[PDB]
Design an enzyme around this catalytic site. Structure first.
Site, PDB file in Angstrom:
ATOM      1  N   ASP A 275       0.842  -1.192   0.000  1.00  0.00           N
ATOM      2  CA  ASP A 275       0.000   0.000   0.000  1.00  0.00           C
ATOM      3  C   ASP A 275       0.880   1.246   0.000  1.00  0.00           C
ATOM      4  OD1 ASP A 275      -2.121  -1.771   0.242  1.00  0.00           O
ATOM      5  OD2 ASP A 275      -3.125  -0.580   1.794  1.00  0.00           O
TER       6      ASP A 275
ATOM      7  N   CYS B  17      -1.063   0.955 -14.289  1.00  0.00           N
ATOM      8  CA  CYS B  17      -1.207   1.245 -12.875  1.00  0.00           C
ATOM      9  C   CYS B  17      -2.219   2.383 -12.826  1.00  0.00           C
ATOM     10  CB  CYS B  17       0.132   1.660 -12.244  1.00  0.00           C
ATOM     11  SG  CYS B  17       0.995   3.065 -13.000  1.00  0.00           S
ATOM     12  N   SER B  18      -2.274   3.093 -11.711  1.00  0.00           N
ATOM     13  CA  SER B  18      -3.220   4.186 -11.574  1.00  0.00           C
ATOM     14  C   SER B  18      -3.132   5.194 -12.721  1.00  0.00           C
ATOM     15  CB  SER B  18      -2.981   4.912 -10.250  1.00  0.00           C
ATOM     16  OG  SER B  18      -3.846   6.015 -10.154  1.00  0.00           O
ATOM     17  N   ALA B  19      -1.979   5.838 -12.837  1.00  0.00           N
ATOM     18  CA  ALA B  19      -1.763   6.850 -13.859  1.00  0.00           C
ATOM     19  C   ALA B  19      -0.966   6.307 -15.039  1.00  0.00           C
ATOM     20  CB  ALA B  19      -1.034   8.050 -13.248  1.00  0.00           C
ATOM     21  N   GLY B  20      -0.366   5.136 -14.857  1.00  0.00           N
ATOM     22  CA  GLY B  20       0.405   4.542 -15.935  1.00  0.00           C
ATOM     23  C   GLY B  20       1.812   5.084 -16.113  1.00  0.00           C
ATOM     24  N   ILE B  21       2.410   5.629 -15.052  1.00  0.00           N
ATOM     25  CA  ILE B  21       3.773   6.136 -15.169  1.00  0.00           C
ATOM     26  C   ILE B  21       4.708   5.725 -14.036  1.00  0.00           C
ATOM     27  CG2 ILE B  21       3.005   8.106 -16.544  1.00  0.00           C
ATOM     28  CD1 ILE B  21       3.363   9.873 -14.133  1.00  0.00           C
ATOM     29  N   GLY B  22       4.216   5.711 -12.798  1.00  0.00           N
ATOM     30  CA  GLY B  22       5.066   5.342 -11.678  1.00  0.00           C
ATOM     31  C   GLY B  22       5.385   3.857 -11.621  1.00  0.00           C
ATOM     32  N   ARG B  23       4.445   3.078 -11.104  1.00  0.00           N
ATOM     33  CA  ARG B  23       4.616   1.639 -11.002  1.00  0.00           C
ATOM     34  C   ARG B  23       4.837   1.069 -12.400  1.00  0.00           C
ATOM     35  NH1 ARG B  23       0.273  -1.129  -6.985  1.00  0.00           N
ATOM     36  NH2 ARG B  23       0.852   0.732  -5.782  1.00  0.00           N
TER      37      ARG B  23
ATOM     38  N   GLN C  90       8.173   7.507 -10.898  1.00  0.00           N
ATOM     39  CA  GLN C  90       7.868   8.713 -10.133  1.00  0.00           C
ATOM     40  C   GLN C  90       8.544   8.954  -8.800  1.00  0.00           C
ATOM     41  OE1 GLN C  90       3.384   8.345 -10.279  1.00  0.00           O
ATOM     42  NE2 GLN C  90       3.558  10.515 -10.842  1.00  0.00           N
TER      43      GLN C  90
HETATM   44  C1  LIG Z   1      -0.716   8.399  -8.895  1.00  0.00           C
HETATM   45  N1  LIG Z   1      -0.019   7.837  -7.703  1.00  0.00           N
HETATM   46  C2  LIG Z   1      -0.022   8.389  -6.419  1.00  0.00           C
HETATM   47  C3  LIG Z   1      -0.661   9.534  -6.048  1.00  0.00           C
HETATM   48  C4  LIG Z   1       0.041  10.781  -6.040  1.00  0.00           C
HETATM   49  C5  LIG Z   1      -0.629  11.973  -5.652  1.00  0.00           C
HETATM   50  C6  LIG Z   1      -2.002  11.927  -5.273  1.00  0.00           C
HETATM   51  C7  LIG Z   1      -2.704  10.687  -5.280  1.00  0.00           C
HETATM   52  C8  LIG Z   1      -2.037   9.495  -5.665  1.00  0.00           C
HETATM   53  C9  LIG Z   1       0.754   7.553  -5.596  1.00  0.00           C
HETATM   54  C10 LIG Z   1       1.017   7.726  -4.278  1.00  0.00           C
HETATM   55  C11 LIG Z   1       2.219   8.251  -3.787  1.00  0.00           C
HETATM   56  N2  LIG Z   1       2.191   8.309  -2.452  1.00  0.00           N
HETATM   57  C12 LIG Z   1       3.232   8.792  -1.524  1.00  0.00           C
HETATM   58  C13 LIG Z   1       3.571  10.245  -1.861  1.00  0.00           C
HETATM   59  C14 LIG Z   1       3.092  11.172  -0.763  1.00  0.00           C
HETATM   60  O1  LIG Z   1       3.788  11.348   0.202  1.00  0.00           O
HETATM   61  N3  LIG Z   1       1.874  11.835  -0.861  1.00  0.00           N
HETATM   62  C15 LIG Z   1       0.679  11.179  -0.779  1.00  0.00           C
HETATM   63  C16 LIG Z   1      -0.158  11.097  -1.928  1.00  0.00           C
HETATM   64  C17 LIG Z   1      -1.403  10.414  -1.859  1.00  0.00           C
HETATM   65  C18 LIG Z   1      -1.822   9.808  -0.638  1.00  0.00           C
HETATM   66  C19 LIG Z   1      -3.004   9.157  -0.582  1.00  0.00           C
HETATM   67  C20 LIG Z   1      -3.032   7.725  -0.623  1.00  0.00           C
HETATM   68  C21 LIG Z   1      -4.272   7.037  -0.564  1.00  0.00           C
HETATM   69  C22 LIG Z   1      -5.488   7.764  -0.466  1.00  0.00           C
HETATM   70  C23 LIG Z   1      -5.468   9.188  -0.425  1.00  0.00           C
HETATM   71  C24 LIG Z   1      -4.230   9.887  -0.483  1.00  0.00           C
HETATM   72  C25 LIG Z   1      -0.984   9.891   0.519  1.00  0.00           C
HETATM   73  C26 LIG Z   1       0.259  10.573   0.449  1.00  0.00           C
HETATM   74  N4  LIG Z   1       0.961   7.812  -2.198  1.00  0.00           N
HETATM   75  N5  LIG Z   1       0.198   7.439  -3.259  1.00  0.00           N
HETATM   76  C27 LIG Z   1       1.230   6.471  -6.395  1.00  0.00           C
HETATM   77  C28 LIG Z   1       2.051   5.318  -6.125  1.00  0.00           C
HETATM   78  C29 LIG Z   1       2.362   4.399  -7.179  1.00  0.00           C
HETATM   79  C30 LIG Z   1       3.137   3.301  -6.889  1.00  0.00           C
HETATM   80  O2  LIG Z   1       4.184   3.103  -7.446  1.00  0.00           O
HETATM   81  O3  LIG Z   1       2.725   2.431  -5.967  1.00  0.00           O
HETATM   82  C31 LIG Z   1       1.855   4.642  -8.509  1.00  0.00           C
HETATM   83  O4  LIG Z   1       2.135   3.797  -9.530  1.00  0.00           O
HETATM   84  C32 LIG Z   1       1.036   5.780  -8.787  1.00  0.00           C
HETATM   85  C33 LIG Z   1       0.739   6.675  -7.716  1.00  0.00           C
END
Ligand SMILES: Cn1c(-c2ccccc2)c(-c2cn(CCC(=O)Nc3ccc(-c4ccccc4)cc3)nn2)c2cc(C(=O)O)c(O)cc21
Length: 255
Positions: free
Chosen positions: A153, A187-193, A234
């Protein structure tokens, strides 16, 4: 030099999970033969990624893009799909379910998909799907969906073993199918994972053809995939996971 106008057009606004993450026009997967009644039907937030083995980096399906997803899979002749996230992670939707329940069949637009068999493996579920076009007769092909479900997670896996074994299976499956198209990875956005799995897969392949002593330039490879889809890989953790994966692979080959 790399525009993303299509993804910015008003008609495609709801076809993006994140308004700020769009595909480069020169590498975007352009969908042909869509519903003539739709203003625009040639768009999907997906990009072709080439290092004869290529990939399609895309976002998880949205309820309104599921049909486009299957049109893409069918068009590109992809036989292998790598889903790197759960449908929902930490209460956030990362992909609408685009496959039918086991033994069930569903029609997505003009695309018919039959889930013929689901099998569980260590860090993943494999769904053998049968994709065909409703209007034709000789278009059916098996699409193997590899659903990696153990990605944490938070952060990335501490050990790359699971992803490497997963990718090894994916690799074997892709090569067991005659002239299979690009391996779809999302993945979610298609760039990180997504970027992480692809970069790793690319590096491992190089090692398979040049030996454990060939030159490996991660930063170079990442910038290379990034010139085809922005933001690939990312986080710092993902970046490091890649380094660890390559080495772990090398060390495994060294017996
Ligand atoms: C598109 N996105 C996002 C994402 C980025 C911004 C907003 C929403 C999602 C994450 C991702 C990255 N962080 C840690 C970075 C951080 O401190 N801020 C943070 C951002 C979102 C949340 C969060 C998580 C679950 C629900 C609501 C907010 C918590 C902390 N949490 N969520 C992510 C991870 C991966 C992966 O590699 O697992 C991916 O492929 C795409 C991701």
């Amino acid at each position: 030099l790399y525009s993303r106008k299509e993804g910015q057009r008003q008609e495609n606004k709801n076809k993006n999970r994140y308004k700020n993450i769009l595909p480069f026009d020169h590498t975007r997967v352009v969908l042909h033969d869509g519903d003539p009644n739709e203003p625009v039907s040639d768009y999907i937030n997906a990009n072709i990624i080439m290092p004869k083995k290529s990939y399609i980096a895309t976002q998880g399906c949205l309820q309104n893009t599921v049909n486009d997803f299957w049109r893409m899979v069918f068009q590109e002749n992809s036989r292998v799909i790598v889903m790197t996230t759960k449908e929902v992670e930490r209460g956030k939707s990362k992909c609408v379910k685009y496959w039918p329940d086991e033994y069930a069949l569903k029609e997505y637009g003009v695309m018919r998909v039959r889930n013929v068999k689901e099998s569980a493996a260590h860090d993943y579920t494999l769904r053998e799907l049968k994709l065909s076009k409703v209007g034709q007769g000789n278009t059916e092909r098996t699409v193997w969906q590899y659903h990696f479900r153990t990605w944490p997670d938070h952060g990335v896996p501490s050990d790359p073993g699971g992803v490497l074994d997963f990718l090894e299976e994916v690799h074997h499956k892709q090569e067991s199918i005659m002239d299979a198209g690009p391996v779809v990875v999302h993945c979610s956005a298609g760039i990180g994972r997504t970027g992480t799995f692809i970069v790793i897969d690319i590096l491992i392949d190089i090692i398979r053809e040049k030996g454990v002593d060939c030159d490996i330039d991660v930063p170079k490879t990442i910038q290379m995939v990034r010139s085809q889809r922005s933001g690939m890989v990312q986080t710092e953790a993902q970046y490091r996971f890649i380094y660890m994966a390559v080495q772990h692979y090398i060390e495994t080959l060294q017996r």
